[PDB]
Design a protein around this nucleic acid. Structure first.
Ligand SMILES: Nc1ncnc2c1ncn2[C@@H]1O[C@H](COP(=O)(O)OP(=O)(O)NP(=O)(O)O)[C@@H](O)[C@H]1O
Ligand SMILES: Nc1ncnc2c1ncn2[C@@H]1O[C@H](COP(=O)(O)OP(=O)(O)NP(=O)(O)O)[C@@H](O)[C@H]1O
Ligand SMILES: Nc1ncnc2c1ncn2[C@@H]1O[C@H](COP(=O)(O)OP(=O)(O)NP(=O)(O)O)[C@@H](O)[C@H]1O
Ligand SMILES: [Mg+2]
Ligand SMILES: [Mg+2]
Lengths: 396, 396
DNA sequence: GCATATATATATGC
DNA sequence: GCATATATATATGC
């Protein structure tokens, strides 16, 4: 037996890779609960999106099948259908080998959300079967895997097509043995695709559930502005949607703002169309140049007096709705961990802060009335915040 | 030439493992700053700690070399010195292959910090050079890597040692090309190792910084009680140090708690001697149980009434300082992410909430004067909080 | 029908 | 500059 009194060469083991991910899923998707479960879905969809963000495809069709598996069809270029430089088909590289793919700087993708090269393999490793249909250059190629991403067929030609017809169609059963639930939730996927559809002013995403025949479809002519509105729908707005966009040593930033009656700060941020829910170097940029440009503004118009300290950030965000969406080139792309919740690209902080800072300073100079009322609300906020502290402190 | 318009099988690159941690350092230590740099220390210490937790090593010393490299010596069993079955020294397999080790429950280890099979390998990949030295079985073996972990010797026997003596000595220089800083910080390391000491009664930990001639040692006999006591040192207490402890399903919970005249809570938790700075299922059951037990004591003794609302867990934790250290078995260990920052194992919410609730019940039932000052403390809390709500609301 | 989680929303302090 | 907890709503499983 292996011991403890007996730690020899025999005791160190090497996982075959997809096996590493079956053993330590937590490292790759976070958790094996339903939140875990849906990260598989996001991995495949992010792949169709990265195709669309490079220019290929105007339609992604997610589909919960009767039997419980899920499908992502796109009209992008297709996965390469030949022999890879390593003696199994390239598709087989995508799905079974880790740290492999097109987004390492080579030039196959423009800006793009994937960057680790694990996504499709992680989905593959964690499924009890998985199928690919590629459409390329007149032909349709299929291949299947079973029992933790194990090839059971080579890539294999099964049909012809119109020649203009291209794209990828993945379908996987998540593994009952890995996940405490394998019940895909139509409500979760609907809300995700909707989030994504905002971010492709030119794309249509769809979800179809053959379990219930429910179906929805998303499309948005004005993108991040439509996003902000959709955050303030059944709410009551105290400003028109501000829309600021710009570029800067290859960064591309798009931002939409609109205040509401409310008191919440509610601001959503995205690197290369990938929601970064914990914020990051980009969100900090925005937060910054609001507080700077508002405080600077109110000092220049005397509405915060001279001997009067500077409002705080909380104040200026109280009631805010903001969608921030940056494209960051691959050479500058850093997130904080195999996930993609937080953004560590130190360049994004001056990028955004810079671009925002200019656009905003110039919006207020133009709408004096709107901008004064924004500074008066901010003043009212620090008044409330201070009254709470006054109180909480009196009581001790 | 590889572009958007020419994407066939050469646009997919396969990164050799250690190159991947160099390509995407965020996925692997989350940042390439002072915080990332100090991650490379903690991985090598946790490896040493893991030996002591299985019973091997009474000592762990850490040195910041004049040249700015850092050593970590342990007297544990030493890494296996022979030939791994994949055809290379086992030492090599540790420092150069990802997803490899003795902690996937094979028996080499009891319960350990580590579990991913990557830490040693990450430190090597991010180092201008790395040197191991194993003492086992009468011999001192030694092996050197350069240029992000490519081996420049093999595992070479370099001399003699006495036949019962054992240990591993890991020296590495962080790679200045990767990190924005490679100054190791003595205060930082001091602090971490202090804390690693409170959980290792059988180990004395050392830090020497040959840059400046300063050293500290660390040894504790009392675990989380010595830890809580130090957490409160220059504060004023208002309670003895409380210590619960219990076992369940092979898990082991230990926790120390103690209150101060302050308004802050100070909960520190640990899985397998590894610090979980974001909590996780085990901190949460810790907190759950404090709250539920204390409101039950509230209503049973009548300091809360029918008409009154249950107190928030926030109220009960003001001035709280606590250290929760659990031991969780490999076959249940699971973090959210590669990062070990928060625990994700489901069975630990019940276990810790079981052990503490039972134990803390028993204690209030029997320390009623104190139990009532506590409850009264949470109330005057709640009245501060609920004073701030009204005095804020009364401002809008 | 009971308690389960789930979608959402505010709350400062170190 | 940084971490969610829950408050209480509703929807759904034991
Ligand atoms: N739908 C698709 N269409 C075309 N190519 C694809 C598609 N999905 C994956 N690929 C290719 O397969 C590679 C592997 O992607 P993937 O396994 O998800 O990792 P990745 O996109 O690079 N980066 P990450 O998603 O951060 O893991 C990609 O880089 C693409 O070249
Ligand atoms: N100080 C040491 N003494 C003895 N064996 C060691 C030591 N350091 C590492 N090892 C061996 O190397 C293996 C892998 O080290 P490491 O790569 O950091 O992996 P891990 O500790 O298993 N997993 P992880 O640390 O989760 O990032 C361990 O399982 C041990 O067998
Ligand atoms: N009393 C408080 N305790 C903890 N966090 C707070 C408190 N008051 C405000 N916050 C912060 O308020 C933020 C709300 O803004 P969000 O857009 O969700 O990001 C959170 O990130 C909290 O860190
Ligand atoms: Mg991807
Ligand atoms: Mg380790």
């Amino acid at each position: 037996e292996i011991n403890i009194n007996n730690y020899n060469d025999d005791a160190i083991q090497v996982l075959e890779g997809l096996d590493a991910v079956r053993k330590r899923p937590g490292m790759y998707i976070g958790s094996t609960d339903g939140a875990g479960l849906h990260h598989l879905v996001w991995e495949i969809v992010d792949n169709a999106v990265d195709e669309a963000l490079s220019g290929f495809g105007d339609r992604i069709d997610v589909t919960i099948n009767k039997d419980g598996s899920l499908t992502v069809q796109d009209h992008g270029r297709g996965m390469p259908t030949g022999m890879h430089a390593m003696g199994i088909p390239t598709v087989e590289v995508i799905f079974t080998i880790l740290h492999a793919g097109g987004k390492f700087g080579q030039g196959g993708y423009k800006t793009s959300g994937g960057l680790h090269g694990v996504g499709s393999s992680v989905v593959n490793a964690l499924s009890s079967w998985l199928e690919v249909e590629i459409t390329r250059d007149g032909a349709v190629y299929k291949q299947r895997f079973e029992n933790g991403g194990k090839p059971v067929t080579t890539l294999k030609k099964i049909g012809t097509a119109p020649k203009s017809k291209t794209g990828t169609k993945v379908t996987f059963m998540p593994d009952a043995t890995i996940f405490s639930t394998t019940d895909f939730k139509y409500n979760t996927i609907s809300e995700r695709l909707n989030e994504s559809a905002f971010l492709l002013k030119n794309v249509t995403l769809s979800l179809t559930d053959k379990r219930t025949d429910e179906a929805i479809e998303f499309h948005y002519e004005n993108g991040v502005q439509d996003f902000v509105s959709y955050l303030n729908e059944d709410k009551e707005i105290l400003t028109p949607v501000l829309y600021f966009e710009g570029e800067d040593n290859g960064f591309q930033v798009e931002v939409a703002l609109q205040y509401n009656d409310g008191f919440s700060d509610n601001i959503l941020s995205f690197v290369n169309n990938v929601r970064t829910k914990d914020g990051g170097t980009h969100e900090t940029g925005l937060k910054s140049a609001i507080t700077k440009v508002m405080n600077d503004y109110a000092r220049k118009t005397g509405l915060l007096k001279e001997k009067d300290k500077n409002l705080e950030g909380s104040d200026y965000r109280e009631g805010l709705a903001a969608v921030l969406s940056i494209l960051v080139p691959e050479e500058h792309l850093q997130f904080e961990g195999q996930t993609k919740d937080k953004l560590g690209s130190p360049l994004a902080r001056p990028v955004v802060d810079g671009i925002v800072a200019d656009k905003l300073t110039f919006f207020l100079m133009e709408n004096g009335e709107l901008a004064s009322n924004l500074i008066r609300k901010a003043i009212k906020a620090r008044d409330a915040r201070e009254a709470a502290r006054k109180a909480r402190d009196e009581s001790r």
